[PDB]
Amino acid sequence: SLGPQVAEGENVFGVCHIFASFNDTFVHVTDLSGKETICRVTGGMKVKADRDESSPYAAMLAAQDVAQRCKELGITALHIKLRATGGNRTKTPGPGAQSALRALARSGMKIGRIEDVTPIPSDSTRRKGGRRGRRL
RNA sequence: GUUCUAUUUUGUUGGUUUUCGGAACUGAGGCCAUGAUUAAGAGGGACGGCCGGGGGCAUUCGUAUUGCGCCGCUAGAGGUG
Protein backbone atom coordinates (compact mmCIF):
# COMPACT_ATOMS: atom_id res chain seq x y z
CA SER A 1 0.00 0.00 0.00
CA LEU A 2 3.14 2.16 -0.07
CA GLY A 3 4.96 2.98 -3.29
CA PRO A 4 8.53 4.30 -3.41
CA GLN A 5 8.10 5.38 -7.04
CA VAL A 6 8.39 8.93 -8.33
CA ALA A 7 5.36 10.01 -10.35
CA GLU A 8 7.01 11.91 -13.21
CA GLY A 9 10.02 9.59 -13.58
CA GLU A 10 8.93 6.02 -14.33
CA ASN A 11 6.05 3.54 -14.09
CA VAL A 12 5.72 0.46 -11.89
CA PHE A 13 5.44 -2.74 -13.93
CA GLY A 14 3.36 -5.82 -13.28
CA VAL A 15 1.89 -8.57 -15.47
CA CYS A 16 -1.65 -9.85 -15.99
CA HIS A 17 -2.30 -13.44 -17.09
CA ILE A 18 -5.63 -13.14 -18.90
CA PHE A 19 -7.07 -16.66 -19.03
CA ALA A 20 -9.93 -16.80 -21.55
CA SER A 21 -11.90 -20.03 -21.47
CA PHE A 22 -15.31 -20.57 -23.05
CA ASN A 23 -16.99 -20.65 -19.62
CA ASP A 24 -15.07 -18.23 -17.34
CA THR A 25 -12.41 -15.50 -17.53
CA PHE A 26 -9.49 -15.13 -15.11
CA VAL A 27 -7.83 -11.72 -14.72
CA HIS A 28 -4.79 -12.32 -12.52
CA VAL A 29 -2.18 -9.63 -11.80
CA THR A 30 1.21 -10.75 -10.49
CA ASP A 31 4.71 -9.25 -10.37
CA LEU A 32 7.59 -9.76 -12.81
CA SER A 33 8.31 -13.16 -11.25
CA GLY A 34 4.68 -14.25 -11.23
CA LYS A 35 5.10 -15.81 -7.78
CA GLU A 36 3.65 -12.87 -5.82
CA THR A 37 0.07 -12.02 -6.74
CA ILE A 38 -1.89 -8.78 -6.35
CA CYS A 39 -5.48 -9.26 -7.48
CA ARG A 40 -7.55 -12.04 -9.05
CA VAL A 41 -11.29 -11.54 -9.55
CA THR A 42 -13.33 -13.48 -12.10
CA GLY A 43 -16.51 -12.97 -14.07
CA GLY A 44 -18.32 -15.43 -11.81
CA MET A 45 -17.47 -13.39 -8.72
CA LYS A 46 -19.07 -10.32 -10.33
CA VAL A 47 -22.10 -11.90 -12.06
CA LYS A 48 -24.01 -14.51 -10.05
CA ALA A 49 -25.07 -16.68 -12.98
CA ASP A 50 -23.03 -19.50 -14.49
CA ARG A 51 -24.16 -18.95 -18.09
CA ASP A 52 -22.64 -15.47 -18.53
CA GLU A 53 -19.38 -15.84 -16.61
CA SER A 54 -17.41 -15.69 -19.88
CA SER A 55 -19.58 -12.78 -21.04
CA PRO A 56 -17.91 -9.49 -22.07
CA TYR A 57 -19.91 -7.62 -19.40
CA ALA A 58 -18.62 -9.91 -16.63
CA ALA A 59 -15.09 -9.68 -18.05
CA MET A 60 -15.41 -5.87 -18.11
CA LEU A 61 -16.55 -5.82 -14.47
CA ALA A 62 -13.67 -8.14 -13.50
CA ALA A 63 -11.16 -5.95 -15.36
CA GLN A 64 -12.53 -2.81 -13.68
CA ASP A 65 -12.34 -4.44 -10.23
CA VAL A 66 -8.76 -5.59 -10.95
CA ALA A 67 -7.83 -2.09 -12.14
CA GLN A 68 -9.36 -0.50 -9.02
CA ARG A 69 -7.58 -2.97 -6.72
CA CYS A 70 -4.32 -2.28 -8.60
CA LYS A 71 -4.72 1.50 -8.34
CA GLU A 72 -5.24 0.96 -4.61
CA LEU A 73 -1.55 -0.10 -4.60
CA GLY A 74 -0.05 2.07 -7.34
CA ILE A 75 1.22 -0.25 -10.06
CA THR A 76 0.86 1.74 -13.29
CA ALA A 77 1.89 -0.45 -16.24
CA LEU A 78 0.93 -4.06 -16.93
CA HIS A 79 2.28 -6.52 -19.44
CA ILE A 80 -0.42 -8.75 -20.92
CA LYS A 81 -0.02 -12.52 -21.18
CA LEU A 82 -3.02 -14.01 -22.98
CA ARG A 83 -3.79 -17.67 -22.30
CA ALA A 84 -6.54 -19.83 -23.77
CA THR A 85 -7.56 -23.25 -22.43
CA GLY A 86 -4.70 -24.94 -24.28
CA GLY A 87 -3.55 -28.52 -24.21
CA ASN A 88 -5.46 -31.07 -26.26
CA ARG A 89 -8.56 -28.83 -26.07
CA THR A 90 -9.20 -25.60 -28.00
CA LYS A 91 -6.54 -22.91 -28.43
CA THR A 92 -8.86 -20.00 -29.30
CA PRO A 93 -9.44 -17.55 -26.42
CA GLY A 94 -12.98 -16.72 -25.40
CA PRO A 95 -14.92 -13.51 -25.98
CA GLY A 96 -13.98 -12.06 -22.58
CA ALA A 97 -10.30 -11.51 -23.41
CA GLN A 98 -10.60 -8.52 -25.75
CA SER A 99 -13.37 -7.02 -23.60
CA ALA A 100 -11.30 -7.22 -20.39
CA LEU A 101 -8.23 -5.88 -22.23
CA ARG A 102 -10.18 -2.92 -23.62
CA ALA A 103 -11.83 -2.41 -20.21
CA LEU A 104 -8.49 -2.12 -18.39
CA ALA A 105 -7.15 0.05 -21.24
CA ARG A 106 -10.06 2.47 -20.83
CA SER A 107 -9.68 2.25 -17.04
CA GLY A 108 -6.13 3.51 -17.45
CA MET A 109 -3.53 0.78 -17.04
CA LYS A 110 -0.42 1.45 -19.13
CA ILE A 111 -0.05 -1.34 -21.69
CA GLY A 112 3.40 -2.89 -21.90
CA ARG A 113 3.92 -5.88 -24.19
CA ILE A 114 1.18 -8.33 -25.15
CA GLU A 115 2.20 -11.94 -25.73
CA ASP A 116 0.77 -15.45 -25.73
CA VAL A 117 1.31 -17.93 -22.89
CA THR A 118 -1.25 -20.41 -24.20
CA PRO A 119 -0.14 -23.94 -23.23
CA ILE A 120 0.09 -25.21 -26.81
CA PRO A 121 1.13 -28.87 -26.56
CA SER A 122 3.92 -30.12 -28.73
CA ASP A 123 2.38 -33.58 -29.07
CA SER A 124 -0.51 -34.14 -26.68
CA THR A 125 -2.35 -37.18 -25.36
CA ARG A 126 -5.84 -38.29 -26.40
CA ARG A 127 -8.55 -35.63 -26.58
CA LYS A 128 -11.61 -35.86 -24.31
CA GLY A 129 -14.09 -37.59 -26.59
CA GLY A 130 -14.54 -40.83 -28.46
CA ARG A 131 -13.58 -41.82 -31.99
CA ARG A 132 -16.58 -39.81 -33.24
CA GLY A 133 -16.48 -36.85 -30.84
CA ARG A 134 -18.85 -34.53 -29.00
CA ARG A 135 -21.80 -34.81 -31.37
CA LEU A 136 -24.90 -32.76 -30.57
C1' G B 1 49.36 -104.43 -82.21
C1' U B 2 45.56 -108.08 -78.63
C1' U B 3 41.13 -111.88 -78.72
C1' C B 4 37.36 -114.97 -81.50
C1' U B 5 35.35 -116.96 -86.08
C1' A B 6 32.27 -118.01 -90.93
C1' U B 7 35.71 -120.03 -94.40
C1' U B 8 37.37 -120.45 -100.90
C1' U B 9 42.12 -123.11 -101.22
C1' U B 10 47.09 -127.08 -100.63
C1' G B 11 43.74 -133.42 -107.08
C1' U B 12 40.88 -136.97 -102.73
C1' U B 13 42.25 -138.68 -96.68
C1' G B 14 44.83 -136.26 -90.60
C1' G B 15 47.18 -131.34 -87.20
C1' U B 16 49.48 -125.86 -86.78
C1' U B 17 50.19 -120.76 -88.69
C1' U B 18 48.85 -117.06 -92.14
C1' U B 19 47.02 -114.07 -97.52
C1' C B 20 41.69 -113.06 -97.57
C1' G B 21 37.00 -111.21 -94.71
C1' G B 22 33.87 -110.47 -90.45
C1' A B 23 32.93 -108.36 -84.21
C1' A B 24 35.29 -106.31 -79.53
C1' C B 25 39.99 -103.74 -76.90
C1' U B 26 44.12 -100.33 -77.91
C1' G B 27 48.37 -96.52 -80.04
C1' A B 28 50.77 -92.86 -83.53
C1' G B 29 48.55 -89.84 -86.77
C1' G B 30 46.21 -86.51 -91.71
C1' C B 31 41.95 -83.20 -92.21
C1' C B 32 37.31 -80.26 -90.48
C1' A B 33 36.17 -72.64 -92.49
C1' U B 34 38.15 -77.80 -86.22
C1' G B 35 32.97 -76.95 -82.92
C1' A B 36 29.95 -71.74 -78.36
C1' U B 37 24.43 -66.66 -83.54
C1' U B 38 22.98 -62.30 -80.76
C1' A B 39 22.49 -60.65 -75.59
C1' A B 40 15.38 -59.26 -76.11
C1' G B 41 13.23 -51.09 -74.56
C1' A B 42 12.88 -60.38 -71.14
C1' G B 43 14.98 -61.59 -66.41
C1' G B 44 18.76 -62.42 -62.56
C1' G B 45 23.66 -60.89 -60.60
C1' A B 46 28.06 -57.75 -59.83
C1' C B 47 29.60 -52.45 -59.68
C1' G B 48 29.33 -46.74 -58.84
C1' G B 49 26.97 -42.60 -56.52
C1' C B 50 22.40 -40.88 -54.72
C1' C B 51 17.50 -41.36 -52.45
C1' G B 52 13.53 -42.91 -49.17
C1' G B 53 7.59 -40.68 -42.25
C1' G B 54 10.93 -48.59 -45.48
C1' G B 55 12.50 -52.54 -40.79
C1' G B 56 14.94 -53.80 -36.00
C1' C B 57 17.93 -52.43 -31.64
C1' A B 58 20.18 -48.92 -28.36
C1' U B 59 20.43 -43.75 -27.11
C1' U B 60 18.41 -38.82 -26.88
C1' C B 61 14.93 -34.42 -27.00
C1' G B 62 10.37 -31.75 -26.63
C1' U B 63 5.85 -30.09 -24.62
C1' A B 64 0.84 -31.18 -22.89
C1' U B 65 -2.05 -33.75 -19.05
C1' U B 66 -2.27 -35.93 -14.14
C1' G B 67 -0.17 -36.09 -9.23
C1' C B 68 3.24 -34.33 -5.31
C1' G B 69 6.55 -30.53 -2.40
C1' C B 70 7.06 -24.86 -1.30
C1' C B 71 5.01 -19.67 -1.64
C1' G B 72 1.14 -15.21 -2.70
C1' C B 73 -4.11 -13.65 -2.57
C1' U B 74 -9.04 -14.75 -2.83
C1' A B 75 -14.68 -17.91 -2.56
C1' G B 76 -15.46 -19.83 -5.75
C1' A B 77 -13.69 -23.54 -9.60
C1' G B 78 -15.21 -27.64 -13.57
C1' G B 79 -19.02 -28.15 -17.06
C1' U B 80 -23.67 -27.02 -20.10
C1' G B 81 -28.45 -24.55 -24.66
Could you tell me the CATH number of the domain that includes residue A56?
Answer: 3.30.420.80
Cβ A15 vs Cβ A32: under 8 Å: yes
Resolution of this deposited model, Å: 3.1
Q: Is the CB of A124 under 7 A from strand B?
A: yes
Quickly give A23 CA vs B8 C1' distance in Å: 140
Quickly list H helices, A24-95. Answer: 43-46, 56-71
**Where in the sequence is the domain holding A1, given as residue range(s)?**
1-136
Domain count for chain A, please give it. 1
Cα–Cα distance, A78 to A24 (Å, whole number): 21
Cα–Cα distance, A111 to A25 (Å, whole number): 19
Quickly give A11 CA vs B15 C1' distance in Å: 159
A49 Cβ contact list (under 8 Å, min separation 6): none
